[PDB]
Amino acid sequence: DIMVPSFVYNKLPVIHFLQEKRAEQKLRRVLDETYTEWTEELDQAHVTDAITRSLNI
């Protein structure tokens, strides 16, 4: 009725702070893993060159 309640009350703030920090850490890790992938596609000039070769030019 008295002792364990008081010590739980004492515990509450530090646990709240640590869990807030943990959530911020999770969000930070989520953000840090984001990279824009630029893709590379076959240049059309080689297609234009193969087209010309096929013509026997």
Partner 1 sequence: VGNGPTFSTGGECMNTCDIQNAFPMNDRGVRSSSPFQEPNTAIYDSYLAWTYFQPMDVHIEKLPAPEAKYYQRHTKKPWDVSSTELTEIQSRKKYFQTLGYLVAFIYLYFLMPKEKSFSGLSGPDGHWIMLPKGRPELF
Partner 2 sequence: WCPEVRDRAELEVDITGWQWWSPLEERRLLPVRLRSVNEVREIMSKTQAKKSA
Partner 3 sequence: VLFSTYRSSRLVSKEFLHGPVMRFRALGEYYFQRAWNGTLNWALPGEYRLYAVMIPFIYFYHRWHNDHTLDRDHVEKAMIMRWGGTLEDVRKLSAKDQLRVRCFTDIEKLYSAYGPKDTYLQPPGDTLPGKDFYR
Q: Could you say whether residue 2 binds partner 3 (CB under 8 A)?
A: yes
Q: Could you say whether residue 6 binds partner 3 (CB under 8 A)?
A: yes
Q: Could you say whether residue 12 binds partner 1 (CB under 8 A)?
A: yes
Angle at Cα 8 formed by Cα 7 and Cα 14, nearest 5°? 100
Candidate residues 36, 39, 44, 56; the one interacting with partner 2 per rule CB under 8 A:
36
Q: How far apart are CA 43 and CA 32, in angstroms?
A: 32
Candidate residues 35, 43, 46, 53; the one interacting with partner 2 per rule CB under 8 A:
35
Q: How far apart are CA 12 and CA 4, in angstroms?
A: 12
